Amino acid sequence: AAAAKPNNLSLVVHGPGDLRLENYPIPEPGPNEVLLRMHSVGICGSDVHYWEYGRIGNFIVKKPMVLGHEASGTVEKVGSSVKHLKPGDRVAIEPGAPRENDEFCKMGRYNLSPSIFFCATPPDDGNLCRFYKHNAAFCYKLPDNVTFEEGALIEPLSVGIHACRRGGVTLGHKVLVCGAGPIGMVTLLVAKAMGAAQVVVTDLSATRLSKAKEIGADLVLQISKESPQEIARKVEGQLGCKPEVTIECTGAEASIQAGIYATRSGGTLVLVGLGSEMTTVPLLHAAIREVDIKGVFRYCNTWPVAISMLASKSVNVKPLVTHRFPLEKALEAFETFKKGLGLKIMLKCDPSDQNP
Amino acid sequence: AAAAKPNNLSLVVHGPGDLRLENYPIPEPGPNEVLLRMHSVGICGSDVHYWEYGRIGNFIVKKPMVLGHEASGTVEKVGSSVKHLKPGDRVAIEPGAPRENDEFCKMGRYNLSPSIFFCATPPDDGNLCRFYKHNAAFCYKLPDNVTFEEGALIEPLSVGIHACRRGGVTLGHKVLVCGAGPIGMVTLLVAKAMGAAQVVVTDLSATRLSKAKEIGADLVLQISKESPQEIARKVEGQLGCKPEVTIECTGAEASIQAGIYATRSGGTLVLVGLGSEMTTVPLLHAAIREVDIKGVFRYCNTWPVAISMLASKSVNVKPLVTHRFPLEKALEAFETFKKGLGLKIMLKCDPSDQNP
């Protein structure tokens, strides 16, 4: 008998509350793609949401979908046209890869390309598996002093990078970050690395705020039932001035309203968090003071920068990882996520290397 | 006896529905001010609103206020430190003059200075009178080939310039202007002057839309009872694509919702029109497609540019003027404004020259 073939065990959502570990064929990379032996994949609230609800808005899992999109791995094989990567290279994977060079890609905002492929957003399969192929231009080599888990953390970190760029965060700024979930946390980390003088973070949880303090938050405000105007007043009271930039990472209407009231005239309110289809806000208050309201849709052009910041030790994302489980314990990892305790949970897909 | 002294008949609002023509003292210019013999003043919907309701939001006329803020005149006398203007100079008056060199002024956005002086916004008296003093830095000399009425039209034109700049309007753009009132009209003129390929204008009035066509609108859409989504669809149908920039000049919630649905991903929705304190909108739809929502608060750094466009005959605002009355017929002029027919009404304050 011939040698045993490798496997491609994958974490798949078939529908609401129907999560399974099953084997998939091993992908064959096209001329401009690379086949990766997956190593580390972080669990994102969105992967969990598809498992629980089978959809997010109008993005419905109509056929079984492999989960996972915050990842790193090792190049196993490269397509005939690939020259910048070779077998053995450790790489961080940027999940959104444009399918066509449309005007959004040409202008530098490929994240807005309508036909973009994106790991684990139906109907595109994610990378929580053993072997996964991806466009080579979107796999970036990791320096030796950057771990696989840091490589996987580049994905959420990039949301923070894109959000801060969209907000115009820069040297000396006072920034308000609403929400201390992983997104608010990486946003806090990025704001500080960019030179923000003070970053204030809000959240409903004292525990999450305590963690925010540990990683750099200068000020924190625990939210209970105060009004948006009251929160704005308290923030200003802590800073001694209004923040030039507010990055909204909760998606809650009251928080968006608070951001409008809190932001300094001429400043910027960045909307990262996802809320309802309709929202009631004091638009006039923002517009009349030229507080711009800018949304974020994932990110673009953040991997090389994230990699440089990690390699130079300019930012430390490691404290964000609270648990790590082998791929086979994915169900337990997802139930742990649901318990709300902990922060970033890593799934280790390579049996030969379960280390960070 | 001694020669008769000059008079300073002024148009004053004492409270809701209480408008009066009354004499004021002749102002004396400080070292950095000029005394102006007022010539032409355009009537703005806001002047009319203070007359009708005695307020706009929390800006209430608590003591009698002189109306008027879109104006031009002749330098009568200059303060000791004034060197760029001399008696006899014809000037356009920029109504917002900072009282202190705060951070907003230093950063180039003096329109956002909290303590700014602004003609006819309580408690600052306007310039619908015979003689008016103003900071010399904000009185701009008019070229001989630019009329007093064009000088007065620089004020509303500047709202259009500031809005197009804030919207990023540039060469080849498809622009949607919501509203065909004077503000939407100057926005249309500026958009075309800046190189917009196509400008679509919407409005409830077929008459105002016909006027829009006469001055440059490439496409017009009369709004009746369609929904925001339907209007957005019609606009895209007419343009063959989504406009990259939408400039909202109505302040109506339905129109703002239409702007969000109509604007191309990555584009900009500029809010000029004033609506209610609270607005219900598909915020998510804009944010998730990175459609920026930017407000406008009057303008900054637009007078020299407006003067250059008028002097070079690059834009024609003359068609906007539909009526002219001497200052003494201000009541008749305001009642005419209320009738709704016509567009820009000019008040002529200098008995020695009632021409354009």
Add this chain to the structure above:
Amino acid sequence: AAAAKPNNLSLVVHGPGDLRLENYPIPEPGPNEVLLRMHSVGICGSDVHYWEYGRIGNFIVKKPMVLGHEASGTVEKVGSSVKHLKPGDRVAIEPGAPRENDEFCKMGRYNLSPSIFFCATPPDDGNLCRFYKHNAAFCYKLPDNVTFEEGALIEPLSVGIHACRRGGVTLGHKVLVCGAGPIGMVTLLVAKAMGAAQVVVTDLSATRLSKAKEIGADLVLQISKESPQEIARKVEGQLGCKPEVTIECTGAEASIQAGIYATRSGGTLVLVGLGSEMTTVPLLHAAIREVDIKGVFRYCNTWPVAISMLASKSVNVKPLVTHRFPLEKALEAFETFKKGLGLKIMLKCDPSDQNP
């Protein structure tokens, strides 16, 4: 015998002074390419330079190269993955097509991609022939009201668009354009379409300046042996102020120096013209007044915009065409170019349609 096959007569430079018309195989388009039946190709000074010198700087014709890069044509056949174009479509061809999605392409500046393919820049063959294949993302459909020659003129026009964008040209600006060759001319056209109040053009030739006046130049200055400071003084004397932007389209050292002296503090000097490897300039004078010096390397993201401006009749490039010859008379067309008389010369490659 079978039907006669089509031909692909091409204009080829073998070396200095060695220009030939010869037949080439008919290209077969890949999945993402289209085969075009060439229609109109404008002659650029660079095509002429390769013919005369066999090189430009270190770009040497080491093997026979087909000339031509300012063109339009008709889609003859499309590759299996092409969906936005179909046989029969009239298209304008953007000559620079990136070979890889490197960081320059991802950031929106694909013109700087090191491995970019560019028609008629050795070793890449141009499009002065019957049939030519090209990446489909870089062939843009022309509206029915835009001619093939206007389609070909988009290439040089795009240099002007890119130059004006890099210069920050906008509403009300006073702009100085050095040089009245086709590049200075399209730059003048673009500056005016963008809202420049006044555009001053300089050149050694009175005839070229007369043409500049015909198409929109507000002021012109004929250059003889004046010093750079003297030219700067004269320009300022004509404008009554220093121009905010200067676009250098000659490549002559004295002109670059004049641009530094002429540009308003805080303004921008754009370098389009190609000069020597080393240049002596009053760098200090520019730096100390924050006059930025920005270069241009062809263009990026200009075709859709150029097409919208032509379709809306916002710019008229037709007057730039002074002669048109069928492909077979290319030698005569190039000798005519050398005579320096005339401006844009068009070569007509489609025997079935020799019209504009």
Add this chain to the structure above:
Amino acid sequence: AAAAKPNNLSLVVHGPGDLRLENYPIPEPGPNEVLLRMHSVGICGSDVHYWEYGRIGNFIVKKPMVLGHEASGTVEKVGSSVKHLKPGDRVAIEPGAPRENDEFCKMGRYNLSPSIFFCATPPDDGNLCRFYKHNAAFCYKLPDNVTFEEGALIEPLSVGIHACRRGGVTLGHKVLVCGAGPIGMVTLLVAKAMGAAQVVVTDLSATRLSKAKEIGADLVLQISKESPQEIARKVEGQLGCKPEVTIECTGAEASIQAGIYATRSGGTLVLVGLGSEMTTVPLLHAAIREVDIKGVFRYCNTWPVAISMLASKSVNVKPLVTHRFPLEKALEAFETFKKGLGLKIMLKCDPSDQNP
């Protein structure tokens, strides 16, 4: 007899090599000015240059001039219109104060105002004295946790802030700083504070480079006799790539040429150092790769930001101070500056407090 009056001993340059300590009248603050009891003043190479040559370019000391412009002090008396400062307030002094609200001030670039007042640039007297009056808008209150010497260091630090802003320095950048003098050093500090991943510093002095390493330089290169191309090659070798931004702080032609060869295409070369009136450089090499060449003229809008970074301990400039002398030992201090050893020398003007 009456109590002794205060004195205003000042350090004055009368001509080349003619420096004197002499008494001046006590200034009287106008309505919008404050009288300051000077505390700490850093010595700048320019103050020293006026002493040695009696001029810098065409800025010549035609009448005796008080030196000094990098300073902090205590508010002694305030003008009648001053409300944000009171006697006793510790303040950092921004030396450039516009005399008129011209277009440069209105647009947010007051540093370019032609008639600006600037301490110690003839004919404007500096602040190396006991009592000095200054426009109140340009005296900024220091937080209690920020020292007088840090307040004085805000001046050179601001050159670094303005240079990094002009260079577009941001998160993850690889930056080349040419020159390890105090200007290159503050530029290094700011670059790192803004998120630069790696900053390479060059200089002729190994001692200055050792100091650079101590405060944050990731890489250093001592320059001996290599050519500009060779240095550019070494820099790229060390970084493993070309720096996106180069900040030239030497003014040397060879260094500027090296910056052009070293900077990544699409990047920026910022010119801070002052060189000769004419410079020979590979302009083409920069222009054709769209490497922008941007100059710096001191700074604008940097004091509040600098104060926020110092107050938040985001940057440490203290290591820059190597010597301190009372005002009376100014001659000794200037001779020490000329010796070349050491970096920033502080002059202490307040006999009642000689501490940092």
